[PDB]
Design a protein around this ligand. Structure first.
Ligand SMILES: O=C(c1ccc(Cl)cc1)N1CCSCC1
Ligand SMILES: [Zn+2]
Ligand SMILES: [Zn+2]
Ligand SMILES: [Zn+2]
Length: 461
């Protein structure tokens, strides 16, 4: 009970308009056979082209929605749509390409999947709302067999070349013509009523239906992300390191300590209200302040309503207007004016951040976090937090080659005295690096309007 048994039943009702007469009684084994593939009773790490929900959720970085529409089955041209927004027309002889034979279409499919996936995943998972033409199209661009390694590296093979008779991963596949050992999941097997559009549109207003294959491909993946990461949420599932996950997370800890430490020193709040992750620890353990925690899990669907977070259930309940509120990746509709905020910007392009449901994004860094669409109006009571580095640490090198640092934003005794010491120059440059990492990863920082770094210079005298 890890992989999907090929002897599992497959409901064929979705198939029966493209494939009239299809048996009601159907297994994956029989379906794979009718798709023109032979598994040869093979114990070589590829037991089934189709995978479980649980397996798909572990391989979310690999999801490519895929849809095929009859254009006029051997008779007629097929429109191939992918969640990348690409439409290819294959002839048997929003990006929309003219009709070409399979021998050239399959080359474009490998190039497209390789460019999309090489920095994301070791595989492809085709996310289907299966009606028949998508499954019958696979024999024309897919080959299967035993698990293999790349000819040029140690990564599992994802592509095959009929020219060279060799196997490549996504990194090494230029000129390859076949997708090799793809995986796939039919969303329609999950038990929905009515068509794709009617189910997608319950949850999402951002993906229209232009009645083209890529639109269905996008809607199919969106619906799948909704089901697996919005309505259902599993934070136990770990995901491999593929990028700067570790640097970004370190940077996040450093910036959070820096900004909160400086807010307490500058404005001397007697109480801090720490709203969000119930596992959260004091980010400034030495600070004078009354530190009060409020538990809120990461919201995957809609931003929290500040009315419901701060709702008073009895008298003598905490005054959130006293001191300052820390919302560190706690996404709310509208922050109060007395807030310090870190808010993930869902629009950011990275390998960590996958497109999500209804303008949200699926941010995958150790764990998967569906994040509600970034909204600028949430920040109306605040301003953007400007970059600064602050330290009360002694000017003292210890233990890196130097250009003397000149910066208005290096808030240290040494800079107060007109000359930045080597230690604080090294720390400044490391912190500016951490800060830039975190920003470019898509985090945005917001602060109460009265916040002024000028107030920090008098914390040394
Ligand atoms: O792969 C095919 C297929 C095979 C041969 C021919 Cl001539 C047409 C279609 N499918 C999808 C699986 S169910 C039966 C149709
Ligand atoms: Zn390789
Ligand atoms: Zn959608
Ligand atoms: Zn110094």
């Amino acid at each position: 009970p890890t992989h999907l048994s090929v002897d599992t039943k497959f409901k064929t009702e979705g198939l029966c308009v493209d494939i009239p007469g299809i048996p009601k009684d159907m297994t994956y084994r029989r379906l794979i056979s009718m798709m023109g593939f032979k598994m040869n009773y093979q114990v070589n790490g590829y037991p089934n082209m189709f995978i479980t929900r649980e397996e798909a959720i572990r391989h979310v970085r690999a999801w490519i929605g895929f849809d095929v529409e009859g254009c006029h089955g051997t008779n007629l041209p097929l429109q191939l749509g992918f969640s990348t927004g690409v439409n290819l027309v294959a002839v048997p002889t929003p990006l929309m390409y003219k009709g070409l034979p399979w021998n050239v279409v399959r080359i474009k499919i490998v190039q497209m999947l390789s460019d999309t996936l090489k920095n994301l995943s070791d595989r492809v998972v085709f996310v289907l709302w299966a009606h028949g033409f998508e499954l019958t199209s696979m024999k024309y661009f897919v080959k299967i067999g035993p698990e293999r390694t790349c000819c040029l590296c140690d990564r599992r093979a994802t592509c095959f070349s009929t020219a060279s008779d060799t196997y490549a991963c996504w990194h090494h596949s230029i000129g390859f013509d076949y997708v090799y050992n793809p995986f796939m999941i039919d969303v329609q097997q999950w038990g929905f009523t009515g068509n794709l559009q009617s189910n997608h549109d319950l949850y999402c207003q951002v993906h229209g239906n232009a009645h083209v294959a890529s639109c269905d491909a996008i809607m199919t993946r969106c619906l799948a992300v909704h089901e697996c990461f919005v309505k259902r949420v599993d934070w136990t599932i770990e995901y491999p390191i593929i990028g700067d996950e570790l640097k970004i997370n370190a940077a996040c800890r450093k910036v959070q300590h820096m900004v909160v430490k400086a807010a307490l020193l500058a404005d001397k709040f007697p109480v801090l209200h720490d709203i969000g992750n119930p596992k959260a620890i004091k980010c400034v353990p030495q600070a004078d302040v009354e530190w009060k925690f409020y538990d809120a899990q990461p919201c995957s669907d809609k931003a929290y309503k500040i009315e419901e977070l701060f709702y008073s259930y009895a008298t003598h309940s905490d005054k959130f207007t006293d001191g300052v509120c820390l919302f560190w990746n706690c996404n709310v509709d509208r922050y109060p004016a007395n807030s310090i905020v870190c808010r993930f910007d869902t629009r950011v392009l990275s390998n960590l951040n996958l497109p999500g449901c209804d303008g949200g994004s699926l941010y995958v860094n150790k764990h998967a976090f569906h994040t509600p669409a970034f909204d600028k109006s949430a920040f109306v009571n605040l301003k953007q937090l400007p970059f600064f580095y602050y330290s009360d640490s002694p000017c003292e090198s210890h233990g890196i080659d130097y250009v003397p640092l000149k910066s208005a934003t290096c808030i240290t005794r040494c800079n107060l005295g007109g000359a930045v010491c080597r230690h604080h120059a090294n720390e400044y440059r490391l912190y500016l690096d951490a800060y830039n990492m975190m920003i470019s990863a898509g985090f945005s920082l917001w602060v109460y309007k009265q916040f002024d770094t000028y107030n920090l210079w008098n914390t040394f005298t």
